[PDB]
């Protein structure tokens, strides 16, 4: 998936620029995993970092 294929990409709450890519700019809703194609493990990890 997009996160796993690139090891240097890190899902951390401080890495806001990465987290913003997974949030809708217009509605501010976090995209569901099928939308971006991330695996469920990383999607759950991303949701926690965004929150």
């Amino acid at each position: 998936c997009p996160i796993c294929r690139d090891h240097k990409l890190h899902v951390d709450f401080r890495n806001v620029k990465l987290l913003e890519q997974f949030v809708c700019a217009h509605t501010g809703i976090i995209f569901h995993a099928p939308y971006t194609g991330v695996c469920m493990k990383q999607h759950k990890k991303l949701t926690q970092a965004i929150q």
Binding site: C24, F31, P34, T36, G37
Partner: protein, 337 residues
């Protein structure tokens, strides 16, 4: 005998057996054996000054020589490696993207159209395939002749798009004919704020019904796979569409461009009626937003507002708002379009 030896072209011509009675009316692969051969190099390993080795080395005029058995075996093995590597190179290829499926041509980019008569490059345009038919007719050439009909669409993603059909006996030719024909039939599609249509569009082209809806930002393209391809070429980012009746690809392409190119912009509506066009977004509250004002004289007669409109409503649109359960297939989670 040395006099019964033939050239490579005639040896491969016979072995391949491409021209033959079986081939035409119903696998061997050609190879080039002079690819890696360097003029002046033989099995014996002789070194020929001026042919396969430097004529002068460190200021010394070289003389004939021969490589040792160990040195020659290395050179033979090295060439064997290079030949094996070349075979690997032939197997390797750069994967291009599939379309709506893995074995289908629909949705596959084939690049920009060819340059024009006076060096008019079209690098900003992208071409997409929509249908590829392999149809056979009955002509004396093969008894049953072969034909390839290709429907393509082109667009710059900035409002200009067009479609054309190209027919030929070879698929590659049908691509060129369609691709360069479509650049001569560019519609311009009006986009509201550059991301969606100006208003709902409902139309019937022959037996194919299309029903498009204007949507807010972030909605994405929730449309027939062929409409998503065209919408990306046009530049529409957020829209909903439903297609019913016949799924003919040509009627859908003709019907889509017919409806998208006949829509009324807000600036046009203000001029036709003479009134201001105001916008009310729920995320901006009651704030009235003026999006278009009449170019000439603003009228003072309010537009008649009927108590009960006589609009013709679609049961499909209304059914949802009436509380009727939708299908299991509606509004499923899908990848970003």
């Amino acid at each position: 005998s040395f006099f019964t030896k033939l050239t490579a072209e005639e040896l491969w011509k016979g072995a391949l057996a491409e021209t033959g009675a079986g081939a035409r009316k119903g696998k061997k692969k050609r190879k080039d054996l002079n690819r890696g051969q360097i003029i002046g190099e033989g099995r014996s390993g002789f070194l020929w000054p001026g042919l396969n080795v430097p004529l002068i080395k460190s200021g010394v005029v070289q003389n004939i020589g021969q490589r040792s058995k160990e040195e020659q075996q290395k050179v033979e093995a090295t060439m064997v490696e290079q030949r094996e590597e070349w075979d690997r190179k032939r197997k390797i290829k750069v994967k291009r993207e599939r379309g709506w499926s893995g074995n289908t041509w629909g949705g596959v980019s084939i690049g920009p159209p060819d340059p024009g008569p006076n060096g008019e490059t079209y690098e900003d345009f992208d071409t997409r395939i929509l249908e590829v038919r392999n149809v056979f007719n009955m002509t004396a050439k093969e008894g049953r002749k072969k034909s390839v009909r290709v429907l393509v669409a082109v667009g710059n993603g900035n409002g200009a798009a067009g479609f054309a059909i190209g027919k030929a006996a070879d698929r590659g030719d049908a691509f060129r004919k369609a691709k360069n024909r479509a650049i001569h039939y560019l519609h311009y599609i009006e986009r509201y704020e550059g991301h969606t249509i100006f208003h709902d569009i409902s139309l019937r082209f022959k037996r194919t019904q299309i029903r498009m809806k204007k949507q807010p930002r972030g909605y994405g393209l929730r449309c027939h796979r062929a409409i998503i391809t065209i919408c990306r070429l046009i530049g529409i980012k957020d829209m909903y569409a439903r297609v019913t009746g016949s799924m003919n690809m040509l009627n859908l392409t003709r019907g889509l461009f017919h409806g998208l190119a006949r829509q009324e912009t807000h600036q046009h509506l203000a001029d036709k009626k003479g009134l201001h066009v105001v916008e009310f977004r729920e995320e901006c509250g009651p704030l009235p937003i003026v999006v278009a004002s009449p170019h000439g004289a603003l009228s003072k007669e309010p537009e008649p507002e009927p108590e009960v409109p006589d609009t013709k409503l679609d049961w499909q649109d209304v059914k949802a708002m009436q509380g009727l359960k939708r299908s299991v297939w509606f509004n499923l989670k899908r990848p970003a379009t």
